[PDB]
């Protein structure tokens, strides 16, 4: 989709950097967490063709199917009594607010190219 | 010549044809042959063998 073409450009460049470096002679894939596996030689990138169909379908019919059961379960627990207070207290401690105070804030306490950059980061953060 | 849109740029062919292409140095040389190397011939993996 053209809608995400600029992001694809970024991913392609990131992928290229991985290809550029000798990230080779690796057996188990260099992955800690997240995405579900698939393998294919270079394919037609125009659309999610059958190799992708099977990957997605394989990630959805035996995959998202039970993920959904688990998330719904998690939500049912969240909405029950007492257990929700535990969540609330956890959430509250992680996220708090106070009168005329800060909120989450970027701490620029490391060496940086320039204070003007530090200010840009603070504005971008805001 | 016929289309005016440019010279042909892909070939779809039998396994035998590709095996030949894979086993010959397609570059310009005296002559050559060897084990199919240039392109993949395994349809179990792809259909796209590579580029001449």
Curated annotation (Swiss-Prot), chain A:
<comment type="function">
    <text>Forms the portal vertex of the capsid. This portal plays critical roles in head assembly, genome packaging, neck/tail attachment, and genome ejection. The portal protein multimerizes as a single ring-shaped homododecamer arranged around a central channel. Binds to the terminase subunits to form the packaging machine. Attaches to the host inner membrane most likely through interaction with host yidC and forms together with chaperone gp40 an initiator complex to form the prohead.</text>
</comment>
<protein>
    <recommendedName>
        <fullName>Portal protein</fullName>
    </recommendedName>
</protein>
<comment type="subunit">
    <text>Homododecamer. Interacts with the large terminase subunit. Interacts with the major capsid protein. Interacts with the capsid vertex protein.</text>
</comment>
<comment type="similarity">
    <text>Belongs to the Tevenvirinae portal protein family.</text>
</comment>
From Swiss-Prot, chain B:
<protein>
    <recommendedName>
        <fullName>Major capsid protein</fullName>
    </recommendedName>
</protein>
<comment type="subunit">
    <text>Homohexamer. Interacts with the portal protein. Interacts with the capsid vertex protein that forms pentamers. Interacts with hoc; one hoc molecule associates with each capsid hexamer. Interacts with soc; this interaction reinforces the capsid structure. A total of 960 subunits of the major capsid protein forms the 160 hexamers.</text>
</comment>
<comment type="similarity">
    <text>Belongs to the Tevenvirinae major capsid protein family.</text>
</comment>
<comment type="function">
    <text>Major capsid protein that self-associates to form hexamers, building most of the capsid in association with pentons made of the capsid vertex protein and one dodecamer of the portal protein. The major capsid protein self-associates to form 160 hexamers, building most of the T=13 laevo capsid. Folding of major capsid protein requires the assistance of two chaperones, the host chaperone groL acting with the phage encoded gp23-specific chaperone, gp31. The capsid also contains two nonessential outer capsid proteins, Hoc and Soc, which decorate the capsid surface.</text>
</comment>
